[PDB]
Amino acid sequence: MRIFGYARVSTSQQSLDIQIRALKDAGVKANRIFTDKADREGLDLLRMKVEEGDVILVKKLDRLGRDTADMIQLIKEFDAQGVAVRFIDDGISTDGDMGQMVVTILSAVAQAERRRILERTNEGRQEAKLKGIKFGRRRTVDRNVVLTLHQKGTGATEIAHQLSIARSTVYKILEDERAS
Amino acid sequence: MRIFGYARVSTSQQSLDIQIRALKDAGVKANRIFTDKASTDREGLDLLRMKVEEGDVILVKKLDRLGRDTADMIQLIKEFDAQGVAVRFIDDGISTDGDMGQMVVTILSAVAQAERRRILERTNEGKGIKFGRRRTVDRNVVLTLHQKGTGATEIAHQLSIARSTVYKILEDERASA
DNA sequence: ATTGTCTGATATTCGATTTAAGGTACA
DNA sequence: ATTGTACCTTAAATCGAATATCAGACA
Numbered sequence: 001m002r003i004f005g006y007a008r009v010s011t012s013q014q015s016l017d018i019q020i021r022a023l024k025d026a027g028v029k030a031n032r033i034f035t036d037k038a039d040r041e042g043l044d045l046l047r048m049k050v051e052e053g054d055v056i057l058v059k060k061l062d063r064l065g066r067d068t069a070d071m072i073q074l075i076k077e078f079d080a081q082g083v084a085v086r087f088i089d090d091g092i093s094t095d096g097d098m099g100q101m102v103v104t105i106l107s108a109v110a111q112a113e114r115r116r117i118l119e120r121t122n123e124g125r126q127e128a129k130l131k132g133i134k135f136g137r138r139r140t141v142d143r144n145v146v147l148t149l150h151q152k153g154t155g156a157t158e159i160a161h162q163l164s165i166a167r168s169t170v171y172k173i174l175e176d177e178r179a180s
Numbered sequence: 181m182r183i184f185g186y187a188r189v190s191t192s193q194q195s196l197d198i199q200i201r202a203l204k205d206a207g208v209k210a211n212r213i214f215t216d217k218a219s220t221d222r223e224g225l226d227l228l229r230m231k232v233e234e235g236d237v238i239l240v241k242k243l244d245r246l247g248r249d250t251a252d253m254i255q256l257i258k259e260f261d262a263q264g265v266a267v268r269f270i271d272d273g274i275s276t277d278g279d280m281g282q283m284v285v286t287i288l289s290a291v292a293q294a295e296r297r298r299i300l301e302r303t304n305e306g307k308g309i310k311f312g313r314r315r316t317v318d319r320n321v322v323l324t325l326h327q328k329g330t331g332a333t334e335i336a337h338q339l340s341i342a343r344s345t346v347y348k349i350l351e352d353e354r355a356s357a
Numbered sequence: 358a359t360t361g362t363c364t365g366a367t368a369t370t371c372g373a374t375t376t377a378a379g380g381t382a383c384a
Numbered sequence: 385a386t387t388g389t390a391c392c393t394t395a396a397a398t399c400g401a402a403t404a405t406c407a408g409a410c411a
Binding site: 010011061062068070071098101104106115119122123124130 | 189190191192194195198242243244248249250253272274280283284286287288290291293294295297298301305307308309
């Protein structure tokens with residue numbers, strides 16, 4: 001249950017001190033803190049060090065990933081590992097009770113805004129399906145060859161060898177056309 | 181206590197009705213449903229803004245269907261939570277009310293002000309999903325050759341690319357500089 | 358016979374989803 | 385050693401927007 005902390009800036013040194021000053025004042029040992037500037041290298045170091053159960057403190061969200069997406073990415077990566085993160089100024093934890101409440105949500109957000117880019121695409125799809133464009137893989141096996149052989153009384157396992165397809169395929173093909 | 185719903189697309193009617201049909205199955209009366217499509221014609225979402233009253237609640241199928249981006253989306257919710265208006269998303273199972281309802285708005289207020297603060301970082305100096313064909317051509321190779329005085333067509337035959345590509349590769353590196 | 362410049366056609370590439378076929382497991 | 389049957393994994397293929405390369409035309 002080690003206590004680690006992270007800060008980042010783009011340029012400024014001074015704001016990098018205020019973060020570290022806040023973090024030590026949070027009972028973070030000096031050797032437990034990592035930083036970055038404009039070179040993500042220290043973050044990577046942190047990715048390495050952390051073991052399950054360890055917890056990391058950050059000033060604000062904006063100091064974590066380079067953007068709203070990356071930020072979520074990293075947290076997800078850390079709760080994958082059973083790590084927990086706690087933000088100070090905004091007062092938030094990926095552990096405890098809200099621990100699940102928290103990451104339930106940052107998931108939806110990312111995946112939402114992802115879905116928003118594709119908004120046009122995935123919609124152009126719904127319309128295509130409407131039109132009756134066929135989806136999925138294209139049928140590579142002759143459904144007439146198979147139905148004929150089984151009409152004659154030829155068996156599954158043989159038809160399987162004959163056409164060099166799987167057997168379970170042949171119980172599938174018959175199921176489909178005997179349904180329709 | 182009233183129940184409303186909102187639905188939003190770009191063009192498709194079909195992906196809209198999918199949302200409407202799912203909002204009627206969620207028990208929203210037909211007149212209580214508003215829509216939009218892309219100009220920024222937000223008319224539906226505005227009309228809604230007007231009609232809700234404290235305690236009334238709005239249903240949206242998925243988060244992506246509220247704002248034009250992550251900001252617009254959060255901006256709107258705070259605005260509703262300010263009125264005692266609650267928003268509930270079906271398919272993601274999230275609400276601004278009930279128990280975790282506060283814990284929901286509390287954090288969303290963090291990212292806005294987190295990313296408001298990111299917008300201010302970029303601004304002073306100046307999509308995330310990669311798309312499109314990968315570069316199969318080494319650029320370093322084309323740069324050095326033309327730098328040495330190798331003509332356009334000599335490089336194109338050397339690396340089995342088209343000449344016209346040779347010029348694209350040059351124009352790109354030139355604007356970057 | 359090549360050189361610049363430009364426009365148009367091909368060719369991939371994404372994410373979430375939708376079907377086709379392969380493969381195991383069991384009675 | 386085969387037969388049904390039920391699920392679980394892969395394997396292509398879907399849309400439109402985005403990016404790269406190709407293939408020529410014209411001066």
